[PDB]
Amino acid sequence: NYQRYPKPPYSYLAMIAMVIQNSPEKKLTLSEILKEISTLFPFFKGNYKGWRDSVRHNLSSYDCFVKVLKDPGKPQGKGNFWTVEVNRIPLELLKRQNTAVSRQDFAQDLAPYIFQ
DNA sequence: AGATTGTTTATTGAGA
DNA sequence: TCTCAATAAACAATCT
């Protein structure tokens, strides 16, 4: 039960960091991240919704994404803010990937959207 | 009751 | 032929 989708040629890591870093407070809920990613990359407004799980997975699986409690009172509370420590980002992951999509035809490097 | 969030385990497949 | 980003899903706990 597996298949690759014609997503934009940027890593989920890069797209997440970009939307976070461009938010007014440099922090966003998961919900806001998903919304903002689909706004910048229309593909994600479509039928396929598994990208939402993928995004959730990246947040927990890279050290550059640090969770911040929405309520100090509840350490196990939901709807927390996510932030990015940009210096903890492996720079190759911000480059445009060569995949089916980018072989057909934002910029080649997302660093100038992130190091802001 | 069903959806969402955060964490984790696991597999896949294509690019270097 | 080896790697790891992409993708799928289990599980617990909160949330609507």
Side-chain angles (χ1 to χ4, degrees), chain A residues 1-115:
Chain A
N1 196 319
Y2 196 93
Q3 156 169 354
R4 293 281 162 68
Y5 298 88
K7 57 175 274 280
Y10 304 103
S11 66
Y12 284 113
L13 185 155
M15 298 189 291
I16 292 164
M18 184 167 58
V19 300
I20 294 173
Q21 285 289 101
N22 289 295
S23 68
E25 292 165 57
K26 303 203 163 57
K27 79 193 193 188
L28 293 177
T29 64
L30 176 49
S31 181
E32 288 166 316
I33 289 168
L34 297 176
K35 181 52 161 73
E36 192 45 46
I37 290 178
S38 55
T39 296
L40 295 183
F41 299 104
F43 169 74
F44 295 123
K45 296 179 190 184
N47 275 156
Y48 172 66
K49 303 283 91 206
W51 64 274
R52 298 178 80 85
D53 178 358
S54 291
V55 157
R56 203 163 84 264
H57 167 80
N58 273 248
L59 281 177
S60 281
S61 57
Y62 291 102
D63 299 339
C64 68
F65 301 123
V66 181
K67 183 179 62 181
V68 167
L69 283 306
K70 185 181 65 167
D71 186 45
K74 310 190 82 205
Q76 268 57 239
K78 310 302 181 168
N80 302 286
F81 305 109
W82 291 94
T83 58
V84 52
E85 301 198 330
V86 303
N87 295 149
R88 294 210 55 144
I89 294 171
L91 294 178
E92 71 270 16
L93 299 189
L94 302 185
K95 305 288 179 295
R96 164 154 95 173
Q97 311 158 310
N98 263 119
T99 63
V101 180
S102 60
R103 278 193 203 95
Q104 300 160 324
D105 202 339
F106 303 119
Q108 193 126 149
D109 181 22
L110 298 192
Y113 305 82
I114 287 171
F115 298 101

